[PDB]
Design a protein around this ligand. Structure first.
Ligand SMILES: [Ca+2]
Ligand SMILES: [Ca+2]
Ligand SMILES: [Ca+2]
Ligand SMILES: [Ca+2]
Lengths: 791, 138
């Protein structure tokens, strides 16, 4: 009734306003900052606001209304005071300050967090590390710290703070920390790439484990890695690049290396030249790049700009790092040779005959065969033909040679490239792991970093896979929060409380169910005489016509989707919202198989290094398989969650972009968690907080009470219904919005309140008697228990 | 082994031990209260009694464990004797005031008197054992 509400605002996310009219599915909002600029808002996008716009709470569960708008506002208020960390129960929200706050990462701050329960100290990444450690020690259970966030949202720093905390507190200090950190330029060179939104985007799932012995002291580290994006190895959109290594090598290698590896500017390589072929450089580093390394695009448009990234300089830094971890020059050149081998492989072309290598591809073939230690003719044969048995079901068969069509030769070529680069990546990670090895360990605490949920104007198979991965991570996040809440309710003695849980298993099944899931239907399309993206798409809609999580593109509200045919796409209703996928190329992106004779070829390279790299399943199903391995690992651990937030797109300090942060809160699954928490008691406050809030309204008799008994007296005096309000062991718990209702009761009728408090007097007096009476009886029993144990 | 009422009563007793209200009892807090009511246990005797019931092995005592950690009338009678510091069979305001302050309760003398008064059924300005037990369960 005149209360402020949050309503949508295109750059702040939400703005404060008043409801001045109602409609069937909308509200008319008058913004507080405009006398009459009223606008319409969907009802479910309008949220109640905290009356105190200057309130700042360390746990958003302390809010009187817990919702996405009040959460957004609370972290905004906190960010304005340089308080970058805020909890939602045990979940840590971390907003990147974009400047150094040494104070809160000092040795003394580290020490202050040791052994402290979460919430006895201000919110901090250190409290998350310490909780993981205490649960690991107590429960004999490895731990995962699962971090979400956009590339550049402060995740790398956040992982470093955890590692710093764990090694300094519970290990031998800087040693393991430094080894893990110093190796990072190497991982980034092979696993990170420029994408449309992010200059330095990690394209693999990274789980950095700190291992401990049975005494819970750190013995070493291990980087587990998952799901390197393979399709980027061979092709990229025009605003994206292949892995950083390719450009660092081209821009930075000495002329002698350039000659030996037959490198030249990136526009000369198919595996680079569909993407952006420009280097990251500044005015000075550009002068260090030989002109023979520069593509026409670079020469015309100039370099890409970044405060940190620089292809020439990063090549140098990478080299330095390789020495810093004892990677000699021979192994280094082995790495570079395989990289260039892959580049030349991609330049080979074919033409109809089966098919042949084009004559103009003879140089590319020679370089590829030399770098990969293969026979030229053998390679030419294995790229253009395959072997098959003349039977399939056990009858006596023989081997035949089957000529490949041009398109199959292209595939064989790209398949070889992807498997070679992927095995090389595997090798780099293992090599990094050799920098902090350990014989044995009892448990680990690991930090997960992986690309989050995303969407663009055009979403293809790559986005589908990423969002699938995130849909499954969100399910894991939801289960674990659900479990923590139910456990908390039991620990607080709240009684029987079934929490209503809308699973997203149906969305997950739409994608991955055997036979009928989208991935299996895509696989099925490969088996048809004339595979097509359109038939695959129609089959999805046909099989799932009644599915809640699936729609044709026409059903989208957006105008950009209105002309997409039913057989050209589909919409998935993900946890973070609806995504329209255009299905063109889904069939081809689903295939990257390497036929056996060509794989055998590379496996038995003349080169020992290449052989050591290696010493019928679709892309979608390998993705599902690897994703499931990632989940198995997570499911075997106790889990803690961090949501890293990027405050703006300009790497600037003190600049909170509300709509961008709201979008991240949604894409990170924080809104999904809040929706989940509404089924329980999402608001709660300690007796101490309630005491400090409300003692001013109480007689002095009551103010002298300890906080729990004060709150008992108040709770009892008011006669609150037992469904909405629960008196816990350490807190009062509220059903959604009921703390606000409690607050309104406390303010709305002083004369009623005074009489209710007067009437509680007898009960309060008895309760206080019984407190000291039963305490004395307790002391006696503890006295007797000592005597009992001594007999 | 306990009724729901007695469990509820011990929960408030638990709160007196749990000074900072984080829902667990430390060794330091345990002895503090016992000492405040005249007991003198050893740091070894406290830790050993805790370890026996420290099921999940975290090193502090939660409420379920406080319960397990805990002839019947003689304890009730001895608890009555905690208040009657001169054993005259009657608890006085000044003696209630003593126990309250040892325990850390903050109140005025009129409040002490009012507690005595509310517990006093017969009417003599001091409380005995008959109503002490009647007050202990209500
Ligand atoms: Ca305590
Ligand atoms: Ca315990
Ligand atoms: Ca006496
Ligand atoms: Ca009496």
């Amino acid at each position: 009734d005149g209360k402020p509400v949050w309503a949508p605002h295109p750059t702040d996310g939400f703005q404060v306003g008043n409801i001045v009219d109602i409609g069937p599915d909308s509200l008319t909002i008058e913004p507080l900052n405009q006398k009459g600029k009223t606008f319409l808002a969907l009802i479910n996008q309008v949220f109640p606001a905290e009356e105190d716009s200057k309130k700042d709470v360390e746990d958003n569960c302390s809010l009187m209304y817990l919702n996405e708008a009040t959460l957004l506002h609370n972290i905004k208020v906190r960010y304005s005071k340089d308080r970058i960390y805020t909890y939602v129960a045990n979940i840590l929200i971390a907003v990147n300050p974009y400047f150094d706050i040494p104070k809160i990462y000092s040795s003394e701050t580290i020490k202050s967090y040791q052994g402290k329960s979460l919430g006895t100290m201000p919110p901090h990444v250190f409290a998350i590390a310490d909780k993981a450690f205490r649960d690991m020690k107590v429960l004999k259970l490895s731990q995962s710290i699962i971090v979400s966030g956009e590339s550049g949202a402060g995740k790398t720093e956040n992982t470093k703070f955890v590692l710093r905390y764990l090694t300094e507190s519970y290990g031998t200090g800087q040693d393991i920390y430094d080894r893990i950190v110093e190796a990072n330029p190497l991982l980034e060179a092979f696993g990170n790439a420029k994408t449309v939104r992010n200059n330095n985007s990690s394209r693999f799932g990274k789980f950095v484990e700190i291992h401990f012995n049975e005494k819970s002291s750190v013995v070493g580290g291990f980087v587990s890695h998952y799901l390197l994006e393979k399709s980027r190895i061979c092709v990229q959109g025009k605003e994206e690049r292949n892995y950083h290594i390719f450009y660092r090598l081209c821009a930075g290698a000495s002329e002698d290396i350039r000659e030996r590896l037959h490198l030249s500017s990136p526009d000369n390589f198919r595996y680079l030249n569909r993407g952006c072929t420009r280097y990251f450089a500044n005015k000075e580093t550009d002068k260090q790049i030989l002109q023979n390394r520069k593509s026409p695009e670079y020469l015309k448009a100039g370099s890409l700009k970044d405060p940190l990234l620089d292809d020439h300089g990063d090549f140098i830094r990478m080299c330095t790092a390789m020495k810093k971890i004892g990677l000699d020059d021979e192994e280094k050149l082995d790495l570079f040779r395989v990289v260039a081998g892959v580049l030349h492989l991609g330049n080979i072309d074919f033409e109809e005959a089966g098919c042949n290598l084009k004559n103009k591809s003879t140089q590319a073939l020679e370089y590829c065969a030399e770098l990969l230690g293969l026979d030229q003719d053998d390679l030419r044969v294995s790229l253009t033909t395959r072997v098959m048995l003349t039977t399939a079901g056990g009858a006596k068969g023989t081997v035949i040679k089957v000529p490949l069509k041009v398109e199959q030769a292209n595939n064989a070529r790209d398949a070889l490239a992807k498997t070679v680069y992927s095995h090389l990546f595997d090798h780099v990670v293992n090599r990094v792991n050799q920098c902090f090895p350990f014989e044995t360990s009892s448990y680990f605490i690991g930090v997960l970093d992986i690309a989050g949920f995303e969407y663009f104007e055009h979403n293809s198979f790559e986005q589908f896979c990423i969002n699938y991965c995130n849909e499954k991570l969100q399910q894991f996040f939801n289960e674990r929060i659900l479990k923590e809440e139910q456990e908390l309710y039991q620990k607080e003695g709240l009684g029987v409380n079934e929490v209503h849980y809308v699973d997203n298993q149906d969305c997950i099944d739409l994608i991955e169910a055997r036979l009928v899931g989208i991935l299996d239907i895509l696989d099925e399309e490969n088996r048809l005489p004339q595979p097509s993206d359109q038939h695959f798409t129609s089959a999805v809609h046909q099989k799932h016509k009644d599915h809640f999580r699936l729609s044709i593109p026409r059903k989208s509200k957006l105008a950009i989707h209105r002309n997409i045919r039913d057989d050209e796409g589909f919409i998935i209703r993900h946890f973070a919202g609806a995504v329209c996928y255009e299905t063109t190329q889904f069939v081809e992106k689903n295939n990257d198989a390497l036929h056996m004779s060509l794989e055998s070829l590379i496996c038995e390279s003349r080169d020992k290094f290449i052989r050591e790299l290696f010493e019928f399943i679709s892309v979608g199903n390998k993705f599902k398989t690897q994703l499931n391995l990632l989940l198995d690992k997570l499911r075997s651990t106790g889990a803690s969650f961090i949501r890293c937030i990027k405050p703006n797109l300009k790497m600037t300090s003190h600049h909170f972009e509300g709509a961008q942060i709201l979008s991240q809160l949604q894409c990170s699954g924080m809104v999904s968690v809040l929706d989940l928490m509404q089924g329980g008691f999402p608001s709660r406050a300690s007796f101490h907080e309630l005491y400090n809030m409300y003692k001013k309204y109480m007689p002095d008799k009551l103010a002298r009470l300890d906080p729990r008994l004060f709150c008992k007296a108040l709770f009892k005096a008011l006669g609150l219904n037992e469904i909405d309000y629960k008196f816990g062991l350490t807190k009062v718990f509220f059903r959604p919005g009921k703390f606000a209702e409690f607050d309104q009761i406390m303010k709305s009728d002083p004369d009623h309140l005074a009489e209710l408090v007067k009437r509680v007097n007898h009960w309060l007096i008895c309760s206080r008697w019984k407190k000291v009476q039963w305490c004395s009886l307790s002391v006696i029993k503890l006295k007797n228990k000592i005597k009992y144990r001594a007999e | 082994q306990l009724t729901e009422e007695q469990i509820a009563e011990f929960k408030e007793a638990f709160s007196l031990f749990d000074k900072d209200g984080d829902g667990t009892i430390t060794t330091k807090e345990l002895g503090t209260v016992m000492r405040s009511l005249g007991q003198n246990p050893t740091e070894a005797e406290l830790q050993d009694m805790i370890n026996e019931v420290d099921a999940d092995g975290n090193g502090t005592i939660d409420f379920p464990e406080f319960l397990t950690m805990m002839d019947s009338e003689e304890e009730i009678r001895e608890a009555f004797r905690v208040f009657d510091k001169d054993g005259n069979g009657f608890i006085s305001a000044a003696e209630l005031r003593h126990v309250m302050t040892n325990l850390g309760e903050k109140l005025t003398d009129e409040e002490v008197d009012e507690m005595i008064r509310e517990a006093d059924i017969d009417g003599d300005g001091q409380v005995n054992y008959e109503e002490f037990v009647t007050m202990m369960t209500s």
